Structure formats: structure tokens, C-alpha cells
Amino acid sequence: NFDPRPVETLNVIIPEKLDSFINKFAEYTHEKWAFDKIQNNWSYGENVDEELKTHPMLRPYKTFSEKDKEIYRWPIKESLKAMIAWEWTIEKAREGEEYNPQPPDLSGVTLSRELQAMAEQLAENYHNTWGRKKKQELEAKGGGTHPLLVPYDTLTAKEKARDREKAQELLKFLQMNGYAVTS
């Protein structure tokens, strides 16, 4: 009994003004992925190689085409579309606090109880998005099941972590850049 219904966002229009945040958070997300990969001794390679630990995306975000940028911008647009569809407000209230990638540390950012509660909704929606997609993939490949095809609330803490973390990162980066997010 799991029928994931992620919020529909095909006809949600992100206001033009948010493009600056999208680009900035996309760069950030690429730079954090790059940091992680590099500290584990990955380097730039023209092709992806797990043995050689090379990756073509280990280069500056500014050097990317629009297609490569879109790898990072799409999921963020999907997040923002869901917030908008839920009729949350995102307004720039304040000025914000903010190959060798040095991404700003978001570890010192505290979210209010209320932003943490919003993060829970975004986290579940990520779960539903993953879930609905996984159902489609399993059908296309002949059936079967997956242990995480359960309601988000029934997941363990360990199981909730990755969705919670993505949601947290979005809201902390919104906060760090001076944005106020309310229900």
C-alpha cells in the first residue's frame, strides 16, 4: 500500500526574479559535489571512470554549457515549483550572509522549527517523486518491488536522511541569501 502522488508542477511558473537564486544554488550544489569528489581524490577526465576516478564535471560551473548547467538547475526548479504549488511565499527580505572548489559551509545555518517543518514536506515530496518514478521503472522492466516503496512517514530516520538533507540544503541556502520562506 504505497501510492506516491508528488505535487504536480508542470504548469507552475517560477517568477523570473528567482533565476538568480537558481543559478547561484545550482553553482553551489555543483561545487559541493565537486568538493566531495575531489577530497576522495577524483580529477577531471574527458570520460567518467570509477577505477581512474575521473569525471568531466570536475570543472568550474562557469565553464559549463546550458545543458550541463541544467543538470543542477532542473531539480532546484522542481523544488521551487512544489513550494509555489503549495502557495508558500519566497521573498528576498534581507541582504544575505553570503580547479579548487571552495563552497561556503552551510553547517552553521539554523532553520527555525517552522522551516524544519517545511523541509519535512519537501522531503516527503522528494520521496513521492522517487517513488512514482520507481513504480514506472519497475513496470517498464517487468514488475517486482522495492523495500522503500512505503509512505515517507514509515521510513526510518536513516531512510529519511537523504530527502531531509536535500530539503534542509535548499532552505538553508535560501536563508543564507536573504530569502524569507513562509507557508
From Swiss-Prot:
Tissue specificity statement from the Swiss-Prot or TrEMBL entry: Detected in skeletal muscle (at protein level). Fast- or slow-twitch skeletal muscle.
Sequence repeat intervals: 1-98, 99-183
Post-translational modification: The N-terminus is blocked. Channel activity is modulated by phosphorylation.
Subcellular location: Sarcoplasmic reticulum membrane
Family as reported in the entry's similarity comment: Belongs to the ryanodine receptor (TC 1.A.3.1) family. RYR1 subfamily.
Domain notes per entry: The calcium release channel activity resides in the C-terminal region while the remaining part of the protein constitutes the 'foot' structure spanning the junctional gap between the sarcoplasmic reticulum (SR) and the T-tubule. Pore opening is mediated via the cytoplasmic calcium-binding domains that mediate a small rotation of the channel-forming transmembrane regions that then leads to channel opening.
UniProt function note: Cytosolic calcium-activated calcium channel that mediates the release of Ca(2+) from the sarcoplasmic reticulum into the cytosol and thereby plays a key role in triggering muscle contraction following depolarization of T-tubules. Repeated very high-level exercise increases the open probability of the channel and leads to Ca(2+) leaking into the cytoplasm. Can also mediate the release of Ca(2+) from intracellular stores in neurons, and may thereby promote prolonged Ca(2+) signaling in the brain. Required for normal embryonic development of muscle fibers and skeletal muscle.
Subunit (UniProt): Homotetramer. Can also form heterotetramers with RYR2. Identified in a complex composed of RYR1, PDE4D, PKA, FKBP1A and protein phosphatase 1 (PP1). Repeated very high-level exercise decreases interaction with PDE4D and protein phosphatase 1 (PP1). Interacts with CALM; CALM with bound calcium inhibits the RYR1 channel activity. Interacts with S100A1. Interacts with FKBP1A; this stabilizes the closed conformation of the channel. Interacts with CACNA1S; interaction with CACNA1S is important for activation of the RYR1 channel. Interacts with CACNB1.
Additional notes on this entry: Binding of [3H]ryanodine indicates that the heterozygous channel is activated by Ca(2+) concentrations 4-fold lower than normal. Single-cell analysis of cotransfected cells shows a significantly increased resting cytoplasmic Ca(2+) level and a significantly reduced luminal Ca(2+) level.
Protein name per its UniProtKB record: Ryanodine receptor 1
Species for this entry: Oryctolagus cuniculus
